[PDB]
XYZ file of C-alpha atoms in Angstrom:
709
model
C -28.712 30.961 19.926
C -26.226 32.878 17.694
C -29.132 34.864 17.140
C -28.712 36.783 20.368
C -24.937 37.625 19.800
C -24.087 41.198 18.725
C -23.493 41.328 14.976
C -19.621 41.631 15.381
C -19.565 38.435 17.450
C -21.953 36.444 15.154
C -20.090 37.230 12.000
C -16.506 36.120 13.627
C -18.455 32.966 14.802
C -19.533 32.156 11.300
C -15.774 32.349 10.411
C -15.296 35.930 9.146
C -12.047 37.588 10.369
C -12.359 40.594 12.601
C -11.445 43.044 9.851
C -14.179 41.520 7.284
C -16.686 41.553 10.160
C -16.458 45.053 11.052
C -16.783 45.812 7.478
C -19.758 43.709 6.922
C -21.436 45.253 9.917
C -21.443 48.638 8.373
C -23.730 46.922 5.569
C -27.045 46.978 7.058
C -28.903 44.957 4.677
C -26.006 42.418 4.436
C -26.083 42.148 8.222
C -29.723 41.809 8.613
C -29.660 39.200 5.926
C -26.558 37.539 7.247
C -28.067 37.280 10.867
C -31.301 35.832 9.212
C -29.725 33.223 7.332
C -27.874 32.156 10.501
C -30.739 32.149 12.660
C -32.665 29.822 10.407
C -29.408 27.710 9.815
C -29.160 27.053 13.617
C -32.884 26.562 13.623
C -32.819 23.402 11.562
C -29.324 22.234 12.551
C -29.989 22.039 16.166
C -26.434 23.000 16.719
C -23.803 25.629 16.715
C -22.922 26.634 13.147
C -19.220 25.570 12.150
C -17.066 27.673 10.216
C -17.594 26.090 6.840
C -21.148 26.317 6.816
C -20.748 29.891 8.168
C -18.579 31.240 5.328
C -21.111 29.780 2.629
C -23.943 31.526 4.594
C -21.943 34.791 4.246
C -21.606 34.248 0.570
C -25.418 33.480 0.206
C -26.046 36.593 2.390
C -23.682 38.875 0.340
C -24.788 37.704 -3.150
C -28.451 36.829 -3.206
C -30.213 39.197 -4.911
C -33.580 37.560 -4.673
C -34.504 37.642 -0.884
C -37.460 35.426 -1.879
C -35.385 32.331 -1.974
C -33.274 32.796 1.095
C -35.128 30.079 3.457
C -34.775 27.891 0.445
C -31.059 28.187 -0.270
C -30.107 28.460 3.461
C -32.023 24.976 4.008
C -29.522 23.253 1.557
C -26.437 25.049 2.996
C -27.660 23.877 6.416
C -28.184 20.277 5.473
C -24.852 20.378 3.834
C -26.208 19.357 0.447
C -24.933 22.721 -0.809
C -21.380 22.526 1.018
C -19.175 23.846 -1.915
C -18.458 27.257 -3.502
C -19.290 26.237 -6.887
C -22.464 24.555 -5.584
C -23.470 27.922 -3.978
C -22.441 29.616 -7.095
C -24.620 27.354 -9.246
C -27.577 27.657 -7.071
C -27.513 31.344 -7.162
C -27.240 31.126 -10.937
C -30.152 28.983 -10.624
C -32.255 31.362 -8.396
C -31.604 34.153 -10.611
C -33.169 32.712 -14.068
C -35.925 30.717 -11.885
C -38.250 33.295 -10.673
C -41.083 30.859 -10.799
C -41.255 30.143 -7.006
C -42.500 26.539 -7.064
C -38.998 25.528 -8.083
C -38.296 21.708 -8.999
C -35.993 20.487 -6.412
C -34.913 17.878 -9.112
C -34.091 20.059 -11.836
C -32.225 22.473 -9.167
C -30.401 19.714 -7.286
C -28.804 18.460 -10.715
C -28.145 21.665 -11.851
C -26.111 22.541 -8.719
C -24.063 19.284 -8.357
C -25.990 18.611 -5.116
C -24.993 14.763 -4.824
C -21.907 15.046 -6.677
C -18.775 13.578 -5.107
C -15.161 14.507 -6.526
C -12.566 12.153 -5.540
C -8.941 12.916 -4.918
C -8.074 10.660 -7.920
C -10.112 12.899 -9.948
C -8.344 16.250 -9.000
C -4.697 14.153 -9.209
C -5.711 13.526 -12.711
C -6.945 16.807 -13.750
C -4.059 18.511 -12.140
C -1.654 16.154 -13.782
C -3.262 16.636 -17.121
C -2.551 20.332 -16.780
C 0.878 20.102 -15.674
C 1.671 17.821 -18.681
C 0.034 20.376 -20.787
C 2.715 23.027 -19.694
C 5.446 20.762 -18.603
C 8.280 22.409 -20.664
C 7.284 25.916 -19.516
C 7.187 24.940 -16.165
C 10.384 23.384 -16.201
C 12.070 26.454 -17.258
C 10.000 29.254 -15.573
C 9.921 27.168 -12.338
C 8.097 29.111 -9.482
C 7.696 32.126 -11.929
C 5.151 30.211 -13.911
C 1.717 31.316 -13.661
C 0.077 28.712 -11.540
C -3.242 30.096 -12.183
C -3.333 28.279 -15.535
C -3.040 25.015 -13.804
C -5.879 25.751 -11.219
C -8.012 27.196 -14.244
C -7.628 24.103 -16.301
C -8.207 21.992 -13.492
C -11.295 23.798 -12.435
C -12.736 23.586 -15.861
C -12.552 19.878 -15.734
C -13.968 19.490 -12.198
C -16.961 21.873 -11.960
C -17.971 20.919 -8.386
C -14.477 20.462 -7.021
C -13.627 22.236 -3.843
C -10.956 25.007 -4.929
C -8.438 24.447 -2.041
C -8.274 20.742 -2.940
C -7.395 21.741 -6.376
C -4.826 24.344 -5.108
C -3.371 21.745 -2.740
C -2.846 19.350 -5.496
C -1.485 21.666 -7.680
C 1.094 22.992 -4.972
C 2.112 19.369 -4.382
C 2.507 18.118 -7.847
C 4.243 21.321 -8.957
C 6.517 20.678 -5.922
C 7.300 17.062 -7.172
C 7.981 18.375 -10.794
C 10.060 21.427 -9.694
C 11.775 20.296 -6.578
C 12.376 23.082 -3.730
C 11.941 26.766 -4.402
C 15.367 27.547 -3.536
C 15.011 31.362 -2.621
C -11.637 -4.506 14.740
C -11.404 -1.061 12.643
C -10.619 -0.506 8.864
C -6.930 -0.836 7.740
C -7.189 2.802 6.683
C -8.413 4.264 9.589
C -5.928 2.048 11.727
C -3.070 3.709 9.778
C -4.256 7.248 10.593
C -1.137 9.236 11.902
C -3.171 10.098 14.979
C -4.327 6.681 15.494
C -0.861 5.283 15.735
C 0.490 8.349 17.555
C 3.204 8.848 15.061
C 4.765 12.504 14.563
C 3.517 14.947 12.103
C 5.989 15.496 9.209
C 8.624 17.868 10.132
C 8.322 17.239 13.907
C 10.599 14.618 14.104
C 11.931 16.083 17.344
C 9.089 15.132 19.476
C 9.628 11.279 18.953
C 11.627 9.264 21.599
C 15.182 9.279 21.613
C 15.477 12.018 18.813
C 18.581 13.976 19.252
C 18.101 17.742 18.821
C 21.417 19.054 17.181
C 22.404 22.788 16.648
C 21.149 22.139 13.119
C 17.880 19.967 13.491
C 15.762 22.823 13.304
C 17.193 24.285 10.186
C 17.478 20.627 8.655
C 13.721 20.211 9.291
C 13.082 23.552 7.570
C 14.765 22.301 4.434
C 13.107 19.018 4.713
C 9.582 20.735 4.810
C 10.635 22.957 1.668
C 11.636 19.770 -0.305
C 8.650 17.865 0.836
C 5.866 20.230 1.401
C 5.110 18.566 4.663
C 3.770 15.522 3.028
C 4.263 11.933 4.637
C 7.056 9.948 2.997
C 7.546 6.017 3.600
C 9.744 3.258 1.808
C 9.486 -0.169 1.184
C 13.200 -1.754 0.660
C 13.177 -5.289 -0.681
C 16.295 -7.062 -2.221
C 15.602 -7.147 -6.040
C 16.363 -10.818 -6.090
C 14.432 -11.781 -3.109
C 11.184 -13.505 -2.565
C 8.192 -12.067 -0.696
C 6.228 -13.940 1.978
C 3.279 -13.176 4.193
C 5.318 -11.192 6.471
C 6.352 -8.836 3.761
C 2.536 -8.185 3.437
C 2.571 -6.456 6.914
C 5.518 -4.417 5.768
C 3.790 -3.437 2.330
C 0.679 -2.815 3.964
C 2.221 -0.669 6.736
C 4.607 1.565 4.427
C 2.283 1.835 1.488
C -0.809 2.035 3.703
C 0.434 4.565 6.182
C 1.585 6.563 3.072
C -1.890 5.934 1.617
C -3.871 6.643 4.758
C -2.123 10.025 5.495
C -1.950 11.772 2.017
C 1.638 10.462 1.540
C 3.781 8.661 -0.728
C 5.848 5.451 -0.792
C 9.188 4.640 -2.329
C 9.712 1.493 -3.644
C 13.618 1.473 -3.103
C 15.163 -1.618 -3.875
C 17.971 -2.990 -1.706
C 20.661 -3.644 -4.288
C 23.676 -2.908 -2.351
C 25.027 -6.281 -2.918
C 26.255 -6.863 -6.379
C 24.558 -10.103 -8.061
C 23.283 -11.277 -11.295
C 19.612 -10.244 -12.288
C 16.808 -12.949 -11.645
C 14.155 -11.098 -13.419
C 11.454 -13.570 -12.144
C 11.926 -12.201 -8.657
C 12.254 -8.647 -9.543
C 9.048 -8.481 -11.317
C 7.216 -10.785 -8.839
C 7.891 -8.060 -6.195
C 6.820 -5.381 -8.204
C 3.570 -7.526 -9.001
C 2.885 -8.518 -5.698
C 2.957 -4.866 -4.484
C 0.694 -3.796 -7.018
C -1.324 -6.968 -6.372
C -2.065 -6.047 -2.967
C -3.434 -2.907 -4.250
C -0.499 -0.323 -4.025
C 1.417 2.037 -6.634
C 5.036 3.163 -5.586
C 5.425 7.011 -5.841
C 8.579 6.164 -7.601
C 10.803 3.464 -8.039
C 14.433 3.898 -6.694
C 17.567 1.622 -6.001
C 20.002 2.001 -3.273
C 22.470 2.006 -6.158
C 21.304 5.472 -7.323
C 22.783 6.872 -4.300
C 26.139 5.117 -4.500
C 27.929 8.495 -5.001
C 26.270 10.351 -2.122
C 26.853 7.367 0.129
C 30.517 7.414 -0.625
C 30.852 11.031 -0.372
C 29.320 10.868 2.910
C 31.643 7.992 3.887
C 34.656 10.005 3.074
C 33.091 12.980 5.188
C 32.785 10.392 8.330
C 36.628 9.836 7.838
C 37.282 13.409 7.885
C 35.308 13.765 11.219
C 37.042 10.811 12.960
C 34.204 8.848 12.923
C 35.230 6.177 10.493
C 38.495 4.371 9.491
C 39.853 1.870 7.092
C 40.122 -1.600 8.991
C 42.248 -4.626 8.180
C 40.487 -7.502 10.452
C 38.876 -10.332 8.731
C 36.007 -11.088 10.763
C 34.698 -9.240 18.863
C 38.252 -8.268 18.901
C 39.213 -4.665 19.393
C 40.556 -3.396 15.848
C 44.235 -2.387 15.679
C 43.275 0.276 13.106
C 40.509 2.224 14.565
C 42.934 4.847 15.833
C 45.002 5.126 12.688
C 45.502 8.729 11.260
C 42.876 10.092 9.380
C 44.906 10.717 6.535
C 45.819 6.938 6.157
C 41.930 6.079 6.227
C 41.385 8.772 3.353
C 44.248 7.237 1.378
C 43.272 3.673 1.734
C 39.562 4.162 1.270
C 40.321 5.722 -1.893
C 42.657 2.723 -2.591
C 39.719 0.295 -1.771
C 37.832 2.151 -4.418
C 40.335 1.904 -6.881
C 40.301 -2.006 -6.456
C 43.669 -2.292 -4.820
C 42.730 -4.770 -2.156
C 41.165 -8.395 -2.182
C 37.548 -9.005 -0.978
C 37.980 -8.877 2.811
C 41.408 -7.258 2.826
C 40.128 -3.805 3.770
C 36.905 -2.684 4.972
C 35.464 0.712 6.162
C 34.157 0.782 9.723
C 32.195 3.504 11.479
C 33.991 4.243 14.844
C 31.505 3.964 17.727
C 30.247 1.414 20.329
C 26.796 0.620 19.901
C 23.749 -0.235 22.255
C 24.334 -3.802 22.450
C 27.959 -3.501 22.709
C 29.034 -4.196 19.313
C 32.061 -2.384 17.964
C 32.582 -0.341 15.060
C 29.979 -1.646 12.423
C 31.201 -2.051 8.751
C 30.158 0.684 6.427
C 32.046 -0.585 3.031
C 33.354 -4.001 1.760
C 35.141 -4.768 -1.322
C 33.240 -6.869 -3.807
C 34.219 -7.735 -7.493
C 31.183 -9.265 -8.807
C 30.007 -7.048 -11.477
C 26.773 -4.999 -10.363
C 23.423 -5.423 -12.491
C 22.969 -1.624 -12.663
C 26.371 0.029 -12.242
C 28.388 -2.875 -13.553
C 31.980 -2.435 -12.659
C 31.856 1.196 -11.919
C 32.269 0.244 -8.131
C 34.157 -2.497 -6.429
C 33.186 -1.295 -2.857
C 29.772 -1.026 -1.548
C 28.015 0.320 1.514
C 26.518 -2.083 4.067
C 22.629 -2.637 4.542
C 22.330 -0.412 7.737
C 24.683 2.345 6.683
C 22.804 2.489 3.207
C 19.312 2.308 3.999
C 19.627 4.941 7.056
C 21.303 7.627 4.543
C 19.182 6.755 1.786
C 16.110 7.386 3.976
C 17.626 10.809 4.524
C 18.260 11.311 0.993
C 14.704 10.370 0.050
C 13.541 12.658 3.109
C 11.414 9.796 4.534
C 9.325 10.868 7.510
C 8.546 7.577 8.774
C 11.008 4.983 8.500
C 9.150 1.899 9.193
C 11.160 -1.479 10.034
C 11.354 -4.775 11.605
C 13.411 -5.495 14.960
C 16.176 -2.390 16.368
C 19.299 -0.218 16.348
C 17.504 3.376 16.171
C 20.368 4.585 18.487
C 22.652 3.836 15.709
C 20.510 5.143 12.927
C 20.419 8.537 14.546
C 23.995 8.237 15.245
C 24.796 8.250 11.574
C 22.605 10.982 10.357
C 23.784 13.163 13.239
C 27.300 12.224 12.716
C 27.093 13.952 9.283
C 24.376 16.635 10.466
C 21.803 15.553 7.653
C 18.418 15.357 8.023
C 17.363 12.768 10.326
C 14.045 10.519 9.765
C 12.188 9.054 12.537
C 12.729 5.222 12.715
C 9.880 3.037 14.076
C 10.206 -0.596 14.717
C 7.215 -3.053 14.301
C 7.081 -6.610 15.245
C 7.671 -9.206 12.602
C 4.810 -11.477 11.423
C 5.456 -15.265 10.687
C 3.148 -18.289 10.437
C 3.546 -21.850 11.557
C 4.140 -24.654 9.017
C 5.777 -22.069 6.804
C 9.466 -21.726 5.281
C 10.454 -18.715 3.645
C 14.379 -18.544 3.361
C 14.849 -18.243 -0.306
C 17.948 -20.610 0.238
C 15.605 -23.166 1.595
C 12.701 -22.565 -0.703
C 15.070 -23.011 -3.647
C 15.948 -26.318 -2.238
C 12.376 -27.544 -1.514
C 12.083 -26.840 -5.266
C 15.746 -28.690 -5.891
C 14.302 -31.647 -4.016
C 10.983 -31.768 -6.166
C 9.241 -31.645 -2.776
C 7.256 -28.592 -4.133
C 6.350 -27.890 -7.942
C 8.069 -24.380 -8.114
C 8.560 -21.217 -5.689
C 5.121 -20.228 -6.504
C 3.615 -23.677 -5.212
C 0.629 -23.349 -3.216
C 2.296 -25.437 -0.209
C 4.407 -22.496 0.251
C 3.615 -19.398 2.022
C 5.341 -16.888 -0.192
C 3.013 -14.155 -1.627
C 3.235 -15.353 -5.115
C 2.342 -18.991 -3.777
C -0.725 -17.586 -1.867
C -1.848 -15.967 -4.872
C -1.521 -19.030 -7.009
C -3.267 -21.145 -4.069
C -6.140 -18.681 -5.133
C -6.059 -16.371 -2.109
C -7.597 -12.871 -2.910
C -5.470 -9.781 -2.245
C -8.347 -8.338 0.003
C -8.207 -11.470 2.237
C -4.378 -11.212 2.955
C -4.823 -7.392 3.390
C -7.950 -8.031 5.747
C -5.797 -10.448 7.512
C -2.993 -7.735 8.069
C -5.742 -5.240 9.193
C -7.046 -7.720 11.886
C -3.634 -9.111 13.212
C -2.764 -5.550 14.377
C -0.599 -2.638 13.860
C 2.160 -2.649 16.681
C 3.318 -6.045 18.146
C 6.316 -8.181 18.296
C 7.722 -11.397 16.474
C 4.217 -13.218 16.426
C 4.401 -16.466 14.882
C 0.666 -17.502 14.198
C -1.339 -20.379 12.900
C -2.399 -20.129 9.151
C -6.124 -21.101 9.644
C -6.590 -17.755 11.242
C -5.645 -16.311 7.651
C -7.747 -18.982 5.647
C -10.553 -17.644 7.801
C -10.090 -14.485 5.922
C -9.650 -16.125 2.730
C -13.152 -17.845 3.152
C -14.819 -14.598 4.107
C -13.874 -12.872 0.916
C -14.370 -15.678 -1.404
C -17.847 -15.996 0.052
C -18.831 -12.635 -1.114
C -17.042 -12.785 -4.397
C -16.485 -16.431 -5.684
C -19.674 -17.579 -7.864
C -20.858 -21.158 -7.341
C -20.521 -23.885 -10.012
C -20.577 -27.780 -9.445
C -18.176 -30.538 -9.848
C -16.690 -33.781 -8.355
C -13.368 -35.931 -8.776
C -14.607 -39.469 -7.966
C -17.299 -39.248 -10.672
C -20.162 -41.961 -11.619
C -22.398 -42.260 -14.551
C -26.137 -41.740 -13.727
C -28.705 -42.814 -16.250
C -32.492 -41.530 -16.257
C -35.030 -44.162 -17.166
C -37.556 -41.174 -17.097
C -37.260 -37.462 -18.101
C -38.963 -35.008 -20.529
C -35.923 -34.728 -22.936
C -31.496 -25.478 -19.307
C -31.994 -25.536 -15.613
C -30.652 -22.123 -14.654
C -28.256 -22.052 -11.809
C -27.834 -18.768 -9.611
C -24.437 -17.044 -9.235
C -24.556 -16.361 -5.756
C -27.008 -18.407 -3.264
C -27.295 -16.311 -0.290
C -28.122 -12.977 -2.639
C -29.729 -13.497 -5.758
C -29.306 -9.884 -6.599
C -26.103 -11.093 -8.376
C -27.614 -13.105 -11.372
C -27.803 -16.573 -12.739
C -26.237 -18.706 -15.273
C -27.828 -21.599 -17.628
C -26.901 -25.189 -17.146
C -27.867 -28.690 -18.688
C -31.195 -30.394 -18.407
C -30.178 -33.758 -20.281
C -30.727 -37.096 -18.638
C -27.140 -38.548 -18.478
C -26.237 -36.522 -15.508
C -23.046 -37.441 -13.478
C -22.713 -37.455 -9.585
C -20.259 -38.185 -6.971
C -18.858 -41.758 -6.082
C -18.872 -40.602 -2.281
C -22.750 -40.079 -2.020
C -23.648 -43.262 -3.981
C -24.000 -46.041 -1.172
C -25.707 -49.228 -0.841
C -25.587 -50.584 2.954
C -27.215 -48.089 5.699
C -26.035 -46.532 8.745
C -27.050 -43.339 11.048
C -26.572 -40.434 8.448
C -26.385 -40.568 4.911
C -28.529 -39.651 1.688
C -29.199 -40.657 -1.915
C -30.626 -32.998 -7.063
C -29.985 -29.279 -6.560
C -32.367 -28.000 -9.018
C -34.515 -30.290 -10.814
C -35.888 -33.621 -9.537
C -35.044 -36.210 -6.782
C -33.883 -39.070 -9.040
C -34.346 -42.340 -7.287
C -32.342 -45.292 -7.788
C -34.181 -47.875 -10.005
C -31.378 -49.971 -11.222
C -27.637 -50.695 -9.535
C -24.834 -51.962 -11.315
C -21.750 -53.833 -10.273
C -18.412 -54.705 -12.092
C -16.217 -57.892 -11.971
C -15.821 -57.326 -8.287
C -17.632 -54.447 -6.214
C -16.994 -51.703 -8.797
C -20.461 -50.068 -8.885
C -20.370 -48.885 -12.301
C -23.231 -47.045 -13.063
C -26.997 -46.313 -12.006
C -30.593 -45.641 -13.269
C -32.725 -42.912 -11.596
C -36.517 -41.693 -12.133
C -38.305 -39.051 -9.646
C -39.165 -35.722 -9.034
C -40.754 -33.139 -6.812
C -37.441 -34.114 1.099
C -34.215 -36.110 1.194
C -30.981 -34.190 1.134
C -30.181 -32.249 -2.134
C -26.854 -32.971 -3.867
C -24.663 -31.742 -6.767
C -24.435 -33.029 -10.203
C -23.060 -32.532 -13.793
C -25.084 -32.822 -17.036
C -23.069 -32.447 -20.051
C -20.066 -31.843 -18.150
C -16.535 -30.000 -19.107
C -13.384 -32.231 -17.934
C -11.210 -30.073 -15.477
C -7.972 -30.949 -13.726
C -7.948 -30.520 -9.899
C -5.182 -30.382 -7.654
C -5.885 -31.043 -3.801
C -3.137 -29.907 -1.307
C -1.682 -30.908 2.054
C 0.317 -29.025 4.875
C 4.060 -28.774 3.443
C 5.499 -29.480 6.979
C 4.192 -32.147 9.111
C 4.645 -30.245 12.257
C 1.809 -27.427 11.905
C 4.372 -25.506 14.292
C 7.607 -24.385 13.103
C 10.009 -26.682 10.955
C 12.949 -24.879 12.445
C 14.305 -26.799 15.122
C 12.289 -25.750 18.279
C 10.942 -29.294 17.921
C 14.445 -30.014 17.063
C 13.762 -32.544 14.632
C 17.345 -32.282 13.483
C 16.356 -31.400 10.022
C 13.685 -29.097 8.493
C 13.817 -31.389 5.192
C 13.099 -34.512 7.428
C 9.574 -32.549 8.383
C 8.641 -32.932 4.662
C 5.244 -34.606 5.044
C 4.751 -37.476 2.461
C 1.285 -36.593 1.609
C 2.105 -33.611 -0.402
C -0.040 -33.108 -3.691
C -3.261 -34.986 -4.698
C -3.785 -34.551 -8.149
C -7.044 -35.611 -9.563
C -6.241 -35.446 -13.566
C -9.273 -34.190 -15.253
C -12.506 -34.927 -13.401
C -15.812 -33.498 -14.445
C -17.138 -29.849 -13.765
C -20.111 -27.662 -14.614
C -19.929 -25.442 -17.908
C -20.148 -22.403 -15.696
C -16.269 -22.823 -15.319
C -16.131 -22.351 -19.103
C -14.688 -18.646 -19.698
C -12.746 -18.847 -16.673
C -9.380 -17.184 -16.743
C -6.307 -17.728 -14.423
C -6.762 -16.589 -10.669
C -10.614 -16.516 -11.111
C -12.223 -18.023 -7.901
C -15.332 -20.343 -7.794
C -17.315 -22.261 -5.222
C -17.541 -26.081 -5.961
C -20.853 -26.307 -4.430
C -20.173 -29.220 -1.630
C -16.410 -29.470 -1.843
C -15.000 -25.891 -1.019
C -13.235 -23.034 -2.756
C -11.148 -23.391 -5.814
C -9.292 -20.984 -8.122
C -7.958 -21.217 -11.644
C -4.149 -22.096 -11.722
C -2.176 -20.101 -14.362
C -1.743 -23.549 -16.392
C -5.381 -23.395 -17.531
C -6.228 -22.746 -21.032
C -9.932 -22.875 -22.161
C -8.897 -26.304 -23.661
C -7.128 -27.878 -20.786
C -8.663 -26.369 -17.554
C -6.905 -26.551 -14.264
C -8.088 -25.856 -10.571
C -6.520 -25.366 -7.327
C -7.895 -26.448 -3.862
C -7.830 -22.870 -2.230
C -9.680 -23.325 1.134
C -12.439 -25.353 2.827
C -15.622 -24.264 3.884
C -15.070 -24.996 7.393
C -12.677 -26.117 10.128
C -13.652 -27.599 13.462
């Protein structure tokens, strides 16, 4: 019992400081009441009272004028229904002004925000709103500005928000605006920093192989002033690249780790190589990121940092850690010990366009872990750059670049695919700049898939595939067109795991997750390709169909009652066998008459029954829709690249390819359907609206089967 502690001990246990407790204790009425509150609280908590509940009980004890209601308010604080300062403040406002003493639980609870949840996004938006409101004055006054106004205006929008959450959001958004004061389990639980055993921001020095220089601690101090201790990550695709399923592990890891840890993630385009824009790919990268449910804190480009990358390269030369080389490209470079001043001179000369591509290079001066000598920092390239045009004719290499851009953007967790971490550190430490922690995870790849841009652009060149978005490809944009829901791909990445190696996997494991999302999300409607006309010799002359079968709590849509209904030519048989059959809603429709064409083309049917056979699917007054059915792109379900050594991955082009249906018949439930909307075609499988589908000429894609075995 906390009820048996001396008041000094009790009060420090409730979370008062020693100083506040020794004061409180002089106040007899407050001590007796605070003690009373705590006794009742521990009673109906069956527990020791945590600090947060304690501070509130303190507030209650110190402010409740009307002792009569103490057991009332304590019960709420205990059961955590009142767990916020403005909740307690509102309950106290309510207790004054309600002496009635049978108090209406519902009135009180609503008046005190009892159930109300305030989300981070909400606080984020209230704070952002206040900042915009004051931005000009914020930018000039900088840290002299009254931060009170921001919390003020934020408070006034969020009555029931925790004040510290507001304060923290204001602090952080002000930091991002001002810069430094220079004076299996859930995907998101899986990416908790504590779950993965990743370092806390600013504690890079605890990670393996990290080097603590004489500047490191100061460097991390500066790091924390710039970042405010926030987790920062990056995703760095080429702006002209094509994303595939492996990139989904990357996107979820970098944006997800940021998201799971109150952090930010940079979309940093790797545009170190000057090349013409291909706007379709760029926007597709941006879209795919958004599509899987993430938003870049900021969009940057490696080319933004060309000036600083160059400056740092000059500084490497000055420190004897880089030199200008004339090897063409391993053979020891004749130039690696040339005088520093020759390297300063020729590096400038490289920049001034005095060398042809390949005639000169800048190299770091080290031996790497794998025995590689002197990796290249800079090459001469004269293709105009899409963003800096002809401003540069020298460009940093990939590893040099994104390592030092990580330092520039103060990345806390640089997450990559395998692993030259030793050389990453070498670079930052050679220049004594902030050194982010690099962590390598294992690639993710799928069998029967080819994802090289050069190879994809030639699957499209050779018409084996309709476009780079074609559902037989395993690119991200393709899987979306094929009809996969983002949730599925993410759920897939969640289930595969967090820390592995090159793990080439079988596609059906993913399609598994596609099914499990379309089941709870894709509404059902009926259709078939091989259609037959069926004639009713019988019926009465709007049979409502549910949206989701296993839970009707979703609603229903009306479909036709007319007698001319159509069915599947795969259900209509004459002869007998072991297993077969032959309606879903109306009757049973027994075969009265049977036609036959010139040969054995059964051309129509007559039917007349109502109501125990086997129920099938049909379409009365049908809408005419195109349907595309797809096969496995590569014959070898396993990899096309030559482990099999087929001698050609273009030989493995499996001749089945596409099965186009050319406007068969479908329920009028798929009428107001927009592209990427997904349905269950009630006996065939899951299908989604291809982006070629107007309301006029509707088109569908065969997303996934209902089962495997």
